[PDB]
Amino acid sequence: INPWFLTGFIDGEGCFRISVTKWRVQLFFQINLHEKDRALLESIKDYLKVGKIHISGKNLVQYRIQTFDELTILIKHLKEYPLVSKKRADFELFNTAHKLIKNNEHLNKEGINKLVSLKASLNLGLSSLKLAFPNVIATRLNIPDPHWLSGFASAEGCFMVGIAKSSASSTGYQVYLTFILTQHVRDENLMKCLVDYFNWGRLARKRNVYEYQVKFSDVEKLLSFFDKYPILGEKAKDLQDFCSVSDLMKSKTHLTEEGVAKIRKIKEGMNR
DNA sequence: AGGTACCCTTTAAACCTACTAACCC
């Protein structure tokens, strides 16, 4: 387990949070995903050797670091292998807060305000706790290895196969392999950077999310990539089945209609 | 006051199709 894959992953799916209740303040960071990939959590768990997994919620598993003193291992990991997403801003923010706690400054009705001003500029914002602290606040704060991208893709990627309805092809259809990786429109910073990292691939706008889409000859490049740094999780069946199509469709086998049958079969049994 | 854990709710991620364009020429 490479130490960048972790950041690459946490950049894509981690969740640094500040909660407030009745005022009790506690910091959490958790990765939440489909139960089928509990083992990936377990891989990560054992890697940091801290935190815990449980069933939040249905057909899912959450993993969480909620002890103060275990969060330090995390924070220590993330400074040396910093993060590239706007999530960064959430860490810096999450981290400052952990400072305040490190000193016990948050037992003061004052520290308590220094923390909400942070919380207010976190993932979503102040909710019911807008009128409690209507004194406002705030001020939120280049790919790194390629193990980052393996991590980033293995969580925020999609390896799918395309059966177009070309009325022109003798089969009446086109097999094509696209690779996708979606992210918020606010991360234009990162998406544009994904393109330059490979010097190829399409950037597209949709529903306020952007997609980095990636020509066979390029499709093959990144195929080579995930030999050098592969995907991890259940999601690497989809890669392999995709990868498989990349062979049985790369010796002119995707043009015979005995083969398209074969492809759909493969495709049919992937993603779902 | 710090754990530790049973829950929850929407939405940004993943996943789909089907037509145009610009390609081997």
Place this chain on the structure above:
DNA sequence: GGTTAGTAGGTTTAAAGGGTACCTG
């Protein structure tokens, strides 16, 4: 002509993102 590609439209869940209560101090 036949194959590619770049595009427009989609659907749906697995995330992206939250809570508060319970022991033990």
